[PDB]
Design a protein around this nucleic acid. Structure first.
Length: 81
RNA sequence: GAGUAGUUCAGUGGUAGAACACCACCUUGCCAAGGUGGGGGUCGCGGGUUCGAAUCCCGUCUCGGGCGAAAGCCC
RNA sequence: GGGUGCGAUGAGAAGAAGAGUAUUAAGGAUUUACUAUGAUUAGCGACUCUAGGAUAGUGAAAGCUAGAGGAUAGUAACCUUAAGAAGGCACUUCGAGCACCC
């Protein structure tokens, strides 16, 4: 949901920073794009599903980053609430 | 008059030069640079003159160009 | 404020390598090669020998080709000492603008 990402209080942008955020489990929701490379997505959805956190899948990664406030797009973004 | 190496130019009778690129090793992270080493050329082509022709002579082709009614000529 | 190129398929900062390497020296060492030079005088042109070649003049010996052999320095290669760097991808965190043009 692009709506939940555009809103929310505490978010984090980028795959590396989202997995690093998963390494402390201070994240409430995880939003990942489907059109992104699976080599980069599987790595985060594995740990996400392992932690027991909810895993969402969205269409485009461009509109994702657009919803995050960034101006280039993001492969994976986590709401750290 | 122009024509020579991949290319840009030189070379005005003593066997073909420079850079830039291609290649090797330095240098296995991948490069790039760099430092060395190396390779490559019917001088447009065939004659001719000469010990010898990228040079000069004649023929020939292309192209630029200029004179011309043209065929042709000049650089 | 205007215009493009790129960026969570990771901008840009930093570190880490890179590396005590490439290199400048101060030497040491005296072979490999690399290139440079062969008195005068003929002579445009000459390290020496071999083999061919091919040769007009000058010449004791000539310009092509292939080997082989000599001393002079200058190199780069093994050491030692003192100095001795660096850009990009990729690593490693921070994580968003960097670059060129009026």
């Amino acid at each position: 949901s692009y709506d939940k990402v555009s809103q929310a209080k505490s978010i984090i942008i980028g795959t590396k920073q989202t997995v690093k955020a998963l390494k402390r489990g201070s994240v409430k929701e995880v939003v990942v794009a489907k059109d992104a490379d699976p080599i980069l997505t599987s790595s985060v959805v594995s740990l996400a599903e392992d932690q027991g956190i909810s895993v969402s899948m969205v269409e485009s990664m461009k509109k994702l980053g657009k919803a995050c406030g960034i101006e280039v797009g993001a492969a994976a973004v986590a709401i750290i609430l």
